[PDB]
Design a protein around this ligand. Structure first.
Ligand SMILES: C[n+]1cn([C@@H]2O[C@H](COP(=O)(O)OP(=O)(O)OP(=O)(O)OC[C@H]3O[C@@H](n4cnc5c(=O)[nH]c(N)nc54)[C@H](O)[C@@H]3O)[C@@H](O)[C@H]2O)c2nc(N)[nH]c(=O)c21
Ligand SMILES: Nc1ncnc2c1ncn2[C@@H]1O[C@H](C[C@@H](N)CC[C@H](N)C(=O)O)[C@@H](O)[C@H]1O
Ligand SMILES: [Zn+2]
Ligand SMILES: [Zn+2]
Lengths: 121, 295
């Protein structure tokens, strides 16, 4: 961890630096905070309480946010993290790299499900 | 066994009433480790089991519930316990957490530094502490009451805890305080709760349920810790997380507990009874201000 975290502080594009690192075989950031949940939720991407379905895992939001974990500036124009203080549902096939999953994907602005992993619009 | 499906073990009055010397704690399964369900951090299961036990207690649960969580960080730089609190508590609860070292969390407010730097402007409803000082491992001589962060917590209970509020404070065989045990006598009820997920540790959560601001039970704190160790030495506890197999009712009940401002003159038998049943808090209802002071 201490390495890829160190890395995203030597660049102007942390998202690209993380993704390039894991795309090139680097070890994903570990110690994301995986919760235990009744897999009976709605399946939306980001929620005030855990909403994993049977095909998902829920993580504490701050722990899967690159900007939170690296203590660097958030890019959102509001300054407010989209994940911190909320729960983030991750497809079960992607739990090897929740941080990279989040960097790589966007929730549907209309249905709040992950585009490609739940959004049916 | 049935107890393996419970979240843990609570110290019974059978051992609270004993009168014994403080002995060394000798657990038969000491330091054994439970593999973790789904590989979540061990503290996910520990905090979930504490919450499950508090689900059986008469906790006050108001709107905008004020919760402070000390010792929330980790060597990993994350706060699994705080995320569990976020999962458990009402969505409009305010969580403030604190740790000596830097971390990131899902709390509403996060403060770094010694808990003594945490200035609580208004009274809170629930205090959770997982603090432990590494120097407690340097056991020399006899096991005496400790000061450390307990001085701070004791003052907080006496000044910055709502009437009706509750506390859960981690202690161990060597990390404990006479004064904190004695303050448990100022609550409607109290116990020490040991999670099944960490049963092989002398860790327990000293629980004060519904603060009354006045002495209900006269406790000799030194003797009570001796009773706690006597209980641990007498009680098989098997490592288990079976209680987490069904989480359909895990969330804290949305009780709607009212918050009232009353002068001390006005606290009669009706008020004390409501406080003791988890049905009332007495404190201000301003906006909570918790910040880092410069000492
Ligand atoms: C109960 N017991 C104690 N000792 C002996 O007495 C010492 C002090 O105990 P102690 O009060 O630390 O309690 P332990 O249960 O170790 O706490 P344990 O579960 O470690 O601690 C719980 C908390 O420790 C904390 N901790 C350990 N390292 C650190 C650290 O470096 N920093 C911080 N902040 N916390 C730490 C961590 O937070 C953890 O959750 C022990 O070290 C043993 O020598 C026992 N020895 C034997 N043979 N059999 C026993 O049953 C036995
Ligand atoms: N005086 C203090 N003020 C604030 N934090 C303290 C103090 N003493 C010890 N601690 C914190 O107590 C914490 C003990 C941790 N094991 C607790 C967190 C636990 N690892 C978790 O599940 O989140 C360490 O992170 C310490 O830095
Ligand atoms: Zn963030
Ligand atoms: Zn959609």
């Amino acid at each position: 961890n201490s390495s890829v975290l160190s890395l995203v502080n030597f660049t102007v594009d942390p998202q690209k630096a993380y993704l390039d690192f894991v795309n090139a075989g680097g070890a994903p950031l570990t110690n994301c905070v995986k919760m235990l949940t009744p897999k009976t939720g709605t399946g939306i991407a980001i929620s005030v309480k855990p909403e994993s379905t049977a095909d998902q895992e829920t993580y504490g939001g701050a722990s899967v946010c690159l900007y939170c974990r690296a203590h660097i500036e958030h890019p959102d124009v509001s300054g407010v993290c989209k994940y911190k203080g909320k729960f983030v549902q991750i497809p079960a096939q992607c739990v090897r790299d929740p941080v990279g999953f989040c960097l790589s994907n966007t929730p549907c602005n209309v249905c709040q499900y992950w585009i490609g992993y739940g959004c049916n619009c | 066994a049935s107890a393996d499906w419970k979240p843990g073990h609570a110290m019974p009055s059978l051992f609270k009433v004993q009168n014994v010397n403080l002995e060394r704690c000798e657990l038969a399964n000491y330091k054994q480790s439970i593999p973790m369900p789904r590989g979540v951090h061990m503290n996910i299961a520990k905090y979930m089991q504490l919450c499950q036990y508090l689900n059986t207690c008469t906790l006050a649960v108001p709107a905008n519930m004020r919760v402070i969580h000390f010792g929330a960080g980790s060597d990993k730089g994350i706060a699994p316990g705080t995320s569990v609190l976020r999962q458990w508590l009402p969505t409009d609860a305010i969580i403030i957490d604190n740790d000596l070292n830097e971390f990131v969390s899902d709390a509403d407010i996060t403060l770094f530094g010694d808990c003594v730097t945490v200035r609580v402007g208004q009274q809170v409803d629930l205090v959770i502490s997982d603090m432990y000082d590494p120097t407690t491992k340097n056991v020399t001589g006899s096991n005496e009451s400790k000061a450390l962060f307990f001085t701070y917590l004791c003052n907080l209970i006496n000044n910055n805890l709502a009437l009706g509020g509750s506390v859960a404070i981690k202690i161990t065989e060597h990390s404990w305080s006479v004064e904190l045990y004695e303050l448990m006598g100022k609550f409607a009820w109290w116990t020490v709760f040991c999670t099944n997920a960490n049963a092989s540790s002398s860790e327990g959560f000293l629980l004060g349920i519904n603060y009354l601001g006045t002495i209900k039970e006269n406790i000799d704190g030194g003797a009570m810790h001796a009773n706690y160790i006597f209980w641990r030495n007498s009680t098989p506890m098997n490592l288990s997380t079976y209680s987490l197999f069904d989480l359909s009712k895990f969330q804290l009940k949305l009780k709607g507990t009212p918050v009232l401002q009353l002068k001390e003159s006005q606290i009669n038998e009706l008020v004390i009874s409501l406080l003791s049943q988890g049905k009332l808090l007495i404190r201000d209802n301003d906006t909570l201000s918790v910040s880092t002071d410069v000492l």
